Amino acid sequence: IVYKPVDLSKVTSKCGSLGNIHHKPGGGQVEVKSEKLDFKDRVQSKIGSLDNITHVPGGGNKKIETHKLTF
Amino acid sequence: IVYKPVDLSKVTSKCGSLGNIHHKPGGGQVEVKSEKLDFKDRVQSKIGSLDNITHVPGGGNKKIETHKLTF
Amino acid sequence: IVYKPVDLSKVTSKCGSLGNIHHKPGGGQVEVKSEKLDFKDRVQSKIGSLDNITHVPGGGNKKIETHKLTF
Amino acid sequence: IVYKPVDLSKVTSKCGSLGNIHHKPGGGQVEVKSEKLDFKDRVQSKIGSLDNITHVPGGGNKKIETHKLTF
Amino acid sequence: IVYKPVDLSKVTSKCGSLGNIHHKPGGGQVEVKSEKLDFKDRVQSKIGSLDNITHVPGGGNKKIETHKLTF
Amino acid sequence: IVYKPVDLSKVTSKCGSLGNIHHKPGGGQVEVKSEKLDFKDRVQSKIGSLDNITHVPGGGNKKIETHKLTF
């Protein structure tokens, strides 16, 4: 008996904001007035941002193998 | 017996905002009044943003193999 | 018996903001007034940010193998 | 002017396994063999239980009122 | 002017397995063989149970009122 | 002007295993063999339990009021 299995194999994930080119992405003009306002619960305001954001809870990678010989 | 399987294979995910070109994506002009407002529950206002965002909970990759020889 | 398995195999993840080019991303102009406001619960305001952010709770990588010979 | 509103009102939820009577709920006979099994991913077996279970993510209760007099 | 509204009202939910009587619900006889099985993904086997279970994500209760007098 | 509002009102939740009677709930007979098993990922086996369980992530209760008089 000869038993010579070969694995020469590749497993990949990419999860991304990637290889991107941003050239001169200039911001605007933003003006906010706000008078006599009442808030009675959770607030998460955001103004004039220009952000780049990535989360990736995923992207996970898994491999399983098994070999048996019985005589 | 001559057991010689070969795996020469690629398994891939790309999950993304990727390979993009953005050239001079200039912002606008934004003006906001707000007077005498009441909010009685959760708020998430957002103004004048110009953002890039990616989430990717997915993109996961899984492989299983099994080899048996019995005599 | 001649048991000579070969693994020459690669398992990879990339979870990221990566390979990116940002050329001259100039900020805008932002103005915010605020008069006589009440907040009665949690707030997280954010103004004029210009951020790069990556979390990556994921990206985890896992491999299992097993070999048996029985006579 | 005589502004005399009356609220004499009840707002209720019951979310439950409740007011129940269980009289002599006797268990059975359970027998399990298990030989030479393989599991390659998550397992949650359960045997011979006789349980009482309640979750209740709900049942939440909300009231809003408002009174104005303007002259 | 004599503004005298009366609310004398009940708003209720019951969401349940409730007010039940269970008298002598005796279990049976259960026997399970299992030989040489393979599982390659998630499993949740369950044997000989005799359970009582309630979920209730709902059952939520909401009330809004508003009163105005203007002169 | 005579502004004399009355609230005499009740807001309640019950989220529960409650008011229940369990009389002589006797357990069964449970037997488990297990031979030559493999588990290659997370397990949570449970045997012969006889439980009472309640979670209640819910049951939250909220009230808001507001009064104005303007002259």
Q: For residue D29, how many other CB atoms are within 10 A of its CB?
A: 15
**What is the three-class DSSP state of F23?**
strand
Structure tokens at B60: 């996961």
d(CA E56, CA E60): 9
- Are F17 and F52 in contact by the 8 Å Cβ rule? The answer is yes
Q: Pick the residue from chain E with its C-alpha nearest to D41.
A: E41
Q: From chain D, pick out residues whose CB is under 8 angstroms from the CB of F11.
A: 10-12, 61, 63
Residue B24, burial from CB neighbour count under 10 angstroms (0-12, 13-18, 19+) = exposed
Tokens of C30: 């932002």
Closest C-alpha among C8, C62, B37, F45 to residue D37:
F45
Q: How far apart are the first and last CA of chain E?
A: 10
Read off the tokens for C17: 């903001």
**Shortest CA gap E17–chain F (Å):** 10
Alpha-carbon distance values, C7 to A9, A48, B5, B64, C10 (Å):
9, 52, 12, 14, 9
Nearest CA in chain B to C40: B40
- DSSP-assigned beta bridge partners for residue C22: A22
* Strand A29-32 relative to strand C29-32, pairing: parallel
Q: Chains D and F: how many Cβ contacts under 8 Å?
A: 265
Q: Where are the beta strands (DSSP E) in C1-71?
A: 2-3, 6-7, 10-18, 21-23, 29-32, 38-39, 52-54, 61-64, 67-70
Which amino acid is it at A38?
A: D
Lay out the sheet containing E61-64: strands in order across. Answer: E61-64, D61-64, F61-64
How many Å apart are CA E29 and CA E54, to the nearest integer? Answer: 25
Neighbours of chain B (3+ CB pairs under 8 A): A, C
Burial E26-44 (b: 16+ CB within 10 A, else e): ebeebeeeeeeeebeeeee
The C-alpha atoms of residue B40 and residue A38 are separated, in whole angstroms, by 8
Of D18, D24, D70, the CB nearest to F23: D24
Asked if A54 and A39 touch (Cβ cutoff 8 Å), the reply is no
Resolution (A): 3.3
Cβ F25–D20 below 8 Å, yes or no? Answer: no
Bridging pattern class, strands D61-64 and C6-7: unpaired
Contacts of A48 in chain C (CB under 8 A): 28, 30, 47-49
Residue whose token pair is 């939520």: E60
**Contact criterion met (CB < 8 Å) for F2 and D2:** yes
- Rounded CA-CA distance A50/B32 in Å is 18
Please tell me the distance from the alpha carbon of residue D4 to that of residue E7, in angstroms, as a whole number. Answer: 12
Nearest by CB to C19, which of A11, A18, A42? A18
Look at residues E57, F15, B57, E3 and name the one whose alpha carbon lies nearest to residue A54: B57
3-state secondary structure chain F: CEECCEECCEEEEEEEEECCEEECCCCCEEEECCECCEECCCECCCECCCCEEECCCCCCEEEECCEEEEC
Query: Helix (H, G, I), strand (E, B), or coil: what is residue E21?
Result: strand
CA B54, distance to chain mean position in Å, is 5
Contact (CB, 8 A) for F20 and D18 = yes
D44: left (phi over 0), alpha (psi -120 to 50) or beta: beta
| Count of Cβ atoms closer than 10 Å to residue D11 Cβ | 22
Q: How many Cβ atoms from other residues are within 10 Å of residue A20's Cβ?
A: 21
Give yes or no for a contact between D31 and E32, defined as CB atoms under 8 angstroms apart: yes
Closest chain A residue to the Cα of C45, Cα to Cα: A45
Phi, psi of E12 (to 5 degrees): -140, 145
Evaluated on CA atoms B55, B57, B58, B60, the torsion sign reads: positive
Amino acid at D21: I
Helix (H, G, I), strand (E, B) or coil at F3: strand
